[PDB]
Amino acid sequence: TGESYGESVKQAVLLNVLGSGEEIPDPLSPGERGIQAKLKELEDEQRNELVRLKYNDKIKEKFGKELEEVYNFMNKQFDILNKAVTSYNKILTEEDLQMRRLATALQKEIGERTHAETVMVKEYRDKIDALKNAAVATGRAIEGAYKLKKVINPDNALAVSVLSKNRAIQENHKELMHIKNEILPRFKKIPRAQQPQIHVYSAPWDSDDVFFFHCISHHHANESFFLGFDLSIDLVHYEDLTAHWHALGAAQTAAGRTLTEAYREFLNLAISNAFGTQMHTRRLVRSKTVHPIYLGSLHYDISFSDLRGNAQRIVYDDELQMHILRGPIHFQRRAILGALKFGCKVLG
Amino acid sequence: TGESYGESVKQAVLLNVLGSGEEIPDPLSPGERGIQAKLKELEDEQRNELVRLKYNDKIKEKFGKELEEVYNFMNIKNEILPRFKKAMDEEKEICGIEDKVIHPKVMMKFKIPRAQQPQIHVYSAPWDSDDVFFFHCISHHHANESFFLGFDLSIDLVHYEDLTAHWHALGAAQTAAGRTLTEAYREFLNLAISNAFGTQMHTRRLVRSKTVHPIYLGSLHYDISFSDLRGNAQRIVYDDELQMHILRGPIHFQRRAILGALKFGCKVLG
Amino acid sequence: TGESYGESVKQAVLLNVLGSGEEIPDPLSPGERGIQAKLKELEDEQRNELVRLKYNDKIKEKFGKELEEVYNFMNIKNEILPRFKKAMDEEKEICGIEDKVIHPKVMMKFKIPRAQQPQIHVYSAPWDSDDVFFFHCISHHHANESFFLGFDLSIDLVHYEDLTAHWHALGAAQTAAGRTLTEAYREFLNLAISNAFGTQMHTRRLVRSKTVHPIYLGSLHYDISFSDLRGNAQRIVYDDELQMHILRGPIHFQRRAILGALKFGCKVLG
Secondary structure: OOOOOHHHHHHHHHHHHHOOOOOOOOOOOHHHHHHHHHHHHHHHHHHHHHHHHHOOOHHHHHHHHHHHHHHHHHOOHHHHHHHHHHHHHHHHHHHHHHHHHHHHHHOOOOOOOOHHHHHHHHHHHHHHHHHHHOOOOOOHHHHHHOOHHHHHOOOHHHHHHHHHHHHHHHHHHHHHHHHHHHHHHHHHOOOOOOOOEEEEEEOOOOOOOOEEEEEEOOOOOOEEEEEEEEOOOOEEEEEEEEOOOEEEOOEEEOOOOOHHHHHHHHHHHHHOOOOOOOOHHHHHHHHOOOOOEEEEEEEOOOOHHHHHHHHHHHHOOHHHHHHHOOOOHHHHHHHHHHHHHHHHHHOO | OOOOOHHHHHHHHHHHHHOOOOOOOOOOOHHHHHHHHHHHHHHHHHHHHHHHHHHHHHHHHHHHHHHHHHHHHHOOHHHHHHHHHHHHHHHHHHHHHHOOOOHHHHOOOOOOOOOOOOEEEEEEOOOOOOOEEEEEEEOOOOOOOEEEEEEEOOOOEEEEEEOOOEEEEEOOEEEEEOOOHHHHHHHHHHHHHOOOOOOOOHHHHHHHHOOOOOEEEEEEOOOOOHHHHHHHHHHHHHOOHHHHHHOOOOHHHHHHHHHHHHHHOOOOOO | OOOOHHHHHHHHHHHHHHHOOOOOOOOOOHHHHHHHHHHHHHHHHHHHHHHHHHHHHHHHHHHHHHHHHHHHHHOOHHHHHHHHHHHHHHHHHHHOOOOOOOHHHHHHOOOOOOOOOOEEEEEEOOOOOOOEEEEEEEOOOOOOOEEEEEEEOOOOEEEEEEOOOEEEEEOOEEEEEOOOHHHHHHHHHHHHHOOOOOOOOOHHHHHHHHOOOOEEEEEEOOOOOHHHHHHHHHHHHHOHHHHHHHOOOOHHHHHHHHHHHHHHOOOOOO
């Protein structure tokens, strides 16, 4: 085969992407999503327990009573909140300092840094090489371990990546410290609720093949889109649906493509195709006059414009549909959801 | 998709009942059952290990505090007595670490213990197995009451039959008369053929499966009184608002919804 | 309840083999393989941590007992001797936190090391993928042996074909004569197309599948002798009741049974 090398690399990357246990849940299976979530939760709690019980001595000598006593007691209010806020702020500052030192050593012309920085850089390079072939606590382990958050609620390329990560961590830490300082005055007196919403619907009588996603943005409240898939016929249908201000006669309304007529037009388009089994058309006709089944909602952390771009890229890209739209139907749905969520990055 | 309140809230509650990975496995697929059983086992044993870990840690901390007081005052009686009280309390708390908790386990066995729990057998036709299957439900502590519930999901076909046998007099002899599994299955297939919404290839597999005994795929025992199971079988074969949710959707969802409805009657929605 | 008790015992043995959720993943869906591997890893980690908890709690119990005895005596060295022995044992056992010996090499593989094991690639046709699919099993430490095993579970056909390349002389020149995997695939598809049990729309998909390379769904490897794989493939092909038990049922369970029979030949069936 003289056309199966770059596609082979892309396919291998796709298979690695789809191999994770708790990533890319099956859109048309609530049980699979529940299984993935429960498995992730179990491993998360087990890892926190292991890292809590692991040291318990150097942690005790560094910041022992401050976090352990509060966690054991909470497992009055103003004092506990102040102590927890101070401990969280000092943890974030310490992480900032150590990653900043690592970054400054990374852009320190490593053939010139001192012995300790050379040792640390070599250790991180060994970590990267081990991960490439395949007592660790990045900083989130402590915060998720002692239930702090729960009760509060060329080598220069890797150098640049680590610098960007350190800058992001510093910004998050500064925001958290400002929030805790504000919370202290209240007692003395991660995005949420703005993420895009994806609802997964499926036509009743042949939902294994035909389904669609309805996506509604937030903090705009007038932009949405419809993305419909039929896998027996290999048909993908996109349309943006919004709401403008339209005056009919002497009255105002929001003249935009309604979801209902969107779904009806998609069904009509899927009916007129020669590859129908002379009964698939019958199923689509029967399902044309009934409300589609709601099959749950998925939420993530990505801008709505990014989702629009990803959907439009899926629609008019040939090799992307050569990759994600060939295979078993379960793999089909998983690859479609992954491509929608991550875009073209799913292949390399 | 214009439906104000009703269908929306029923489908929401149904998804929330089916949104958990611990309960209601797909009966047709023993792999999902194994995954769910292992997941249950890991949750329970890790909660046991967590409570034992916490109680041993707290008793060790109490002992170390007593030791440190002894060390720092050697060169605490009111503390020693409170320490002994705490140690006795912690030993009592940590005694049930060997998983000897049967009261919570038997709390659901108020009237239905083991060897009295009703059995459910899952059967499937040999060829279009993913779409057609049925349950043979047998009761214990009676050995005389049983029923048949058959679903052909592609065509939207549901059949219920009552296989209860009873004493009968035949001349100068006696017998146990009543419907039996073989003729129930054969009549169900016979009724499935004459439906108008066949596929002229689905019918071929059905008629070929009419001459072969069904395939046994396991048994399930759930904490539902067999009288209640019969009641749910009556509701599922009679009512239509319940069916309009349970019998519409992807096949894996449809089968899980059917198992859930058989388990909880009409409690999955509302 | 059906026809025979030998068939039911064989089926029960097969269902118990497939009952576990940590073994015999679905060969076509890599998500299932990932889930099963992660569950197995979590289970082994929990096993090791339970062992470590037992170790640490017994060490702490001995240390606390020695400390309490010393504290009671303090309120010569003869009494402190057991405490010193406990301290020595605790230090020795704490410094022995290693489970990394080469016994784990036979504790997990027990048959063959790395780079001396066959690998099974899995492909499926692009369009009707969930039914037609094949395994390309290529071995190691024989630079010329491999084989092909293809399945079409819609019309229930199994095909096997060796792809071994023997040295051959043609004219006054030499070649490594075997079968091309592409030629094997096209002959398998041609066999599937000309089957009388055609849907007349399934054939237009096999025919479309002929002129495009198949999709690579992944590669896996199990520690079994390659000759055993050859024997198991001809066992799958040339047995009647093995086909009747493994190649009948739900598609998911069918594929799991196929992988299981590749794993164990007929010992899985009993």
